[PDB]
Design a binder for this molecule. Sequence first.
Ligand SMILES: CCCCCCCCCCCCCCCCCC(=O)OC[C@H](COP(=O)(O)OCCN)OC(=O)CCCCCCCCCCCCCCCCC
Ligand SMILES: CCCCCCCCCCCCCCCCCC(=O)OC[C@H](COP(=O)(O)OCCN)OC(=O)CCCCCCCCCCCCCCCCC
Ligand SMILES: Nc1nc2c(ncn2[C@@H]2O[C@H](COP(=O)(O)OP(=O)(O)OP(=O)(O)O)[C@@H](O)[C@H]2O)c(=O)[nH]1
Lengths: 61, 55, 347, 98, 320, 87, 120, 49, 139, 175
Amino acid sequence: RQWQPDVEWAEQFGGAVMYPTKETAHWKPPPWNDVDPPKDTLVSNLTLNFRLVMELSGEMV
Amino acid sequence: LLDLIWLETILPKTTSFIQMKMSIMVSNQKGLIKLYFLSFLITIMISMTLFNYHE
Amino acid sequence: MNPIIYTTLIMTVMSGTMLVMISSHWLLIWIGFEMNLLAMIPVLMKNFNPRATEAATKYFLTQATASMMLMMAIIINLLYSGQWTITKMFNPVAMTMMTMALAMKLGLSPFHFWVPEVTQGISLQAGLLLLTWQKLAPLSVLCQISQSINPNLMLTMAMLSILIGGWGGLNQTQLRKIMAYSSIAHMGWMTAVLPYNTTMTILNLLIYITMTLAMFMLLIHSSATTTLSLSHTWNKMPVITSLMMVTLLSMGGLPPLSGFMPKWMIIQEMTKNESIIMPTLMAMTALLNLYFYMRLAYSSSLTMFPSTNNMKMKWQFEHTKQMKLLPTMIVLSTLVLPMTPALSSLN
Amino acid sequence: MPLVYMNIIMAFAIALAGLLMYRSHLMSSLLCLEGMMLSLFIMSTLIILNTHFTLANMMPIILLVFAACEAALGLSLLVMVSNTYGTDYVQNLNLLQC
Amino acid sequence: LQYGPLAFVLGERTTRKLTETSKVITVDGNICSGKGRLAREIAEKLGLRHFPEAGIHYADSTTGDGKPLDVQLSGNCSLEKFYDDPKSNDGNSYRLQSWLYASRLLQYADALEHLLSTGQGVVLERSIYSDFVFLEAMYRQGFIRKQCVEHYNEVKKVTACEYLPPHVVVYVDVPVPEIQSRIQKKGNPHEMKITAAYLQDIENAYKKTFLPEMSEKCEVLQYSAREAEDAEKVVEDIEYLKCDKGPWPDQDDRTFHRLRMLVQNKLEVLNYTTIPVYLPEITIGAHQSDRVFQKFTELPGRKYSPGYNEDVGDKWIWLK
Amino acid sequence: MNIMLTLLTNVTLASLLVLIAFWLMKFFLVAITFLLFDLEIALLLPLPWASQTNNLKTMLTMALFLLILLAASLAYEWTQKGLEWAE
Amino acid sequence: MMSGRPGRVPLQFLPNEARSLPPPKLTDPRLVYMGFLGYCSGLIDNAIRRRPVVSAGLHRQLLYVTSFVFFGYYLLKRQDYMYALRDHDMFAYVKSHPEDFPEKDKKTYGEILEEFHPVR
Amino acid sequence: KFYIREPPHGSPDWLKVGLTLGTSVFLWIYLIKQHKEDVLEYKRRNGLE
Amino acid sequence: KTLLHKYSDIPEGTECHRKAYASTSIGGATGLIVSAYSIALKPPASFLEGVARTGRYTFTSAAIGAIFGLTSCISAQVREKPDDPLNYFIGGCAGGLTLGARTRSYGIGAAACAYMGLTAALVKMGQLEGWQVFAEPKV
Amino acid sequence: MTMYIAFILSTIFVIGFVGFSSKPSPIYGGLGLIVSGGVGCGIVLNFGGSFLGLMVFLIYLGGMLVVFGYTTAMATEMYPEVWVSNKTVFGAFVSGLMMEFCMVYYALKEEEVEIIFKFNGLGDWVIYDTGDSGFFSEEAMGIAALYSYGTWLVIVTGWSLLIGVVVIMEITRGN
Ligand SMILES: CCCCCCCCCCCCCCCCCC(=O)OC[C@H](COP(=O)(O)OCCN)OC(=O)CCCCCCCCCCCCCCCCC
Ligand SMILES: CCCCCCCCCCCCCCCCCC(=O)OC[C@H](COP(=O)(O)OCCN)OC(=O)CCCCCCCCCCCCCCCCC
Ligand SMILES: Nc1nc2c(ncn2[C@@H]2O[C@H](COP(=O)(O)OP(=O)(O)OP(=O)(O)O)[C@@H](O)[C@H]2O)c(=O)[nH]1
């Protein structure tokens, strides 16, 4: 049979940057969902010392 | 020596190597708005003033 | 988002772009530009992922800056002319000031930095609108004021576009990014002939739209975003990647595949204007575009790539998307070359 | 060309430089983004008032009005950045590196 | 047409169809812990569309005749093979799980489509959220490797994110000596070859991670197999609750258009199941893939798009 | 002349007093809605002079157009949660 | 180039005086190519949808051919019109500026020298 | 029948197809009509026939 | 285009000091622009590193221009043929050899002629023949 | 200076313009441009644009920046910027005084300032005309013509604002 690409051939066309270099050594492939995983939650659950300790979600307790 | 060592490294590989290096940093920016818009600032300044396109 | 507002948000984008080409007043020219920008952002933000928000910020910052810069191209024009009519610019400083404004909205010279990044962040459907429809409006203004445009200034923008556009695609693995870089290279081609004969710019625009439409829905049908994801598509749908190869070569510009028609006409027009170095370097570096073009063709259908076991699942089910106007777009974008003398219709 | 026109013209030029020369906080650019149109709005009024172009008094209002939708569009995108990273700092505005 | 934009424009909602009997039931348990029968009992007591436990040929029993296909033509893996040989070289172990996860995932999409088009609840066995307990347990004794896990959970996050968690989970608690003694009573020669080590790993993975990780998404209705036998008990308190946890008791017609966009597109639900991660146990080279696909082509029905097969008997091809 | 002269003395009278008296997402959402609910106010701010035009018919149908468009924009916010301060 | 000529009412696909030209015949080789492209669209449509391309519905292909034939014929008239216009105003101009295009006198090759270059 | 469920195209959609021929027959009859007087008008506009 | 006119106005092979000063001015001006872009798109370390990179880029560009102007003018009047295209070509390695030494690797130096040498030769053909690169729209 | 009062008005306009364009804290940047916004009104007011001067107060000064300062309130950097925090902002500020005081002095000279454009920086009072406005106010009549002559201008402005409100809610709901 004629030659067909193996896994190593695919890895050639498989990096984040097609021609790797030191400047792009640590560049990572994009997530398949195109959705970067959520970071630490930026919720302002500020507990107000009403002494009554009580948190809020900006408006709501 | 000539055919498949030099004649392939004079035209083919050198142009491939030249195109390789240029494509290295053209495709590799940093994704920072500060660096981008700053490169806009020179581009606008150099366009009007020193290429003399206003004249 | 909700389709009814999604319909009218996109629908206004046509309306804003429509207004750019159907208003003789400079103020209304900006009016359609920023109505267009106002409704473009939510479509970018349709997916609502951190990358989608990332893409929208870059696009808005770039587009907003150009349009405010566009006003003062108008303002000095008014300052030295008192005319709001869309004709020959009367002030050299405003004229260049305008050209940089529109070029950034089009992204050819290093204004192009947002074009790859913004394209990758947004979804494939949103990428279609960004690189196809939200490009007529800046070209509409340039066509009207082409006679006045500074030849050195415009051509310099053109070569830097195709040169970078050629080089940028050689190293991107994402299908969206190489799509964007080739879009930049084509954009240099149209604006290059723009000072000489606007009919060829429109012909290039009309032709270039065809593949960019055709390629995008093909990718959407393939549901592929990276080269490896495109590689698997041969197994489930060997036909679809076969047509993608044909239109991919047509984008390269190899006769008789239509797509060489714009490049052919540009070279002939520039040659008639005694400019002969401009086309040669322009055509020579078009090979740079062809490399990562063929490179995609190598991994698409020309050599079958390894597949995965789960792909056996996909064979059982048929596609549900409707991909309207795809069959006409593919055919009209690969074999229309013998109908080249239809150029007089655009005149 | 009168001095007052020169003063506004340079006012934008620093504003254009101010927006293009960027800083860590994305707020400041948004101030300068619509600041640059304020000079556009201010000078626009100057020519029309000077030239007695009665009908062209149209422009100064509507120019600002759509500049407002952009600013309204501006910070609305900004809060999403703040709701994903914590600060609008633009050095972290690089998720699209790849 | 389906929920495609025109149907949504003409006023067709989905909250209009939803009633109190609209929940996702995950009646899980242990290996052959009797949860399969409890699935039918719960389904028939409250009138929920029951879904049989997903297997290797589940997708085969979705399209065409809804009949199992050749293992080579569909799946290439064999649970019996994994049952007989624990650690083989053909890679049946991991490939069985990943194909299983995809089959369960397709089952989830079919379940949601029925619910989102009828408003009637659905009960499923071994939901796609559970699936990871088996694979990690298979890793504990060495059925798969470290590099195997990376592909599976990568598919898990890119796929299971958009699907909403279930409302009701029934963990039929059956203890290890009973299962390790009951598997002799089944008698199917493949499932005698079950190690207590592989069993011991699956239950501890269940209680410690399956219930807690999605407890905040829906309440945990723990039920011993003794409680599982008395179907009358479990049917009271499934109704005695609301399931305020998770994002399901917040969604509206805005998200439901998106949800029925994806589930209707069967290719879209599993488009991400084929991630180009080149793991040796699932990567199939071109030569085998081409021949197998060519074998798939000239099979009846599969030659053309559905309804366009003259071989089956679809007349009016020259007009349709 | 008088306008800055006024402006001058009020500020200084306030400046002298402060020195002498010392040396001796929904919250965001309502913000932009107001901004987008404030611009067309400037559109309809010129109107007492607009009513002096010769063509009352166009003026009447047009100022009515903005107000009903203002009503529609308000109505869209009202129905699609909008004005509701997201709890 | 055209765009801006006298009597050029815009958004018109076929001005009235364009009808004074010979309309293309239905067997025009350019026109039959339009039909060929339409037919090729029909094959692609069935191939895209995984249908028996050769005879997968004679209704879809028939519309494809007719629509392309239609749009071609109207495009051909505008094609024929502009080229006729392009040559027409030239002849008016060439008689409007006689001094710019003076007829050079004709001298047979019995007079003009061509300094024949031998080949060796 | 092989398929468990009737597919969306697995039936002759008489109303849709009948429209398709209706589009074409009206299209051709317009085309052969338009060529007729356009030729006839060109005959008499220049004085040929 | 003061710099371009300044270099062109000096007759070929005459006032080599004027030609060299004119040539290095163009080289230095171009070196400034590329360095500014390099700093822009690639932010360096503390400002000393930024000026260090700026110094390198300007010095290399100025060096290439200065000696090229010297070799071109020298080649013109020493051989007493001002219209010779080869006059600039030997400047190509001259400029090229300079680059090959600035990076301390003659592999780039070897390729440096064949392209810069041809282009430097090519520019001379443009001046003699009358080639226009950015031609004004004529038709 | 009485003769060049608008010139003082114009000069104050740019110094505040430079201050906030120097990227200070957004609250401080707000101060830098609002004083620039106020002083620019005096320039328009001095020319006769009574409504246009007073109107920029209400929608830009008392408008734009109130919600803008609202946004910086929720940004609430734990390290709020003061002009002394970084030397870059001071460098821009002393710069912004530098070239401004430079070419105004050169303007005070022979008056052939030719940066970019050609400017004759004479007293700004010269540019006005000698034509009375009768009874009708020129600025007031022009804007009032929005509902009589601004047929297309009002429609697109109204349409875009309606698009403006829907897009704002569409991109802030976060799906
Ligand atoms: C300009 C230069 C050339 C440019 C174009 C080159 C294109 C090919 C280049 C190489 C492409 C990549 C390598 C090969 C990829 C193959 C892709 C593929 O899917 O192959 C397998 C597939 C199997 O066939 P299948 O899809 O089942 O369809 C059968 C017919 N229904 O095969 C197919 O899907 C192919 C189906 C083809 C069907 C053809 C039908 C022709 C009908 C002709 C009718 C003529 C009537 C004449 C009448 C005359 C009188 C009027
Ligand atoms: C007849 C009139 C003129 C007479 C004088 C001769 C012409 C002018 C002088 C020569 C100009 C061309 C030679 C190159 C000059 C710039 C050199 C330069 O930028 O060097 C830095 C760098 C190369 O080194 P790098 O790859 O960065 O590796 C080290 C990394 N640490 O650079 C790079 O990495 C990027 C690649 C080089 C920069 C881009 C190309 C610059 C030159 C463009 C053409 C300029 C033409 C000027 C003359 C005609 C127009 C006036
Ligand atoms: N690898 C793997 N196998 C699974 C998974 N879910 C179910 N299975 C297999 O499915 C088969 C049938 O499940 P059993 O519990 O043994 O039998 P059953 O007939 O379903 O009985 P009940 O569990 O009582 O309904 C067994 O071989 C399981 O190991 C999974 O997520 N991964």
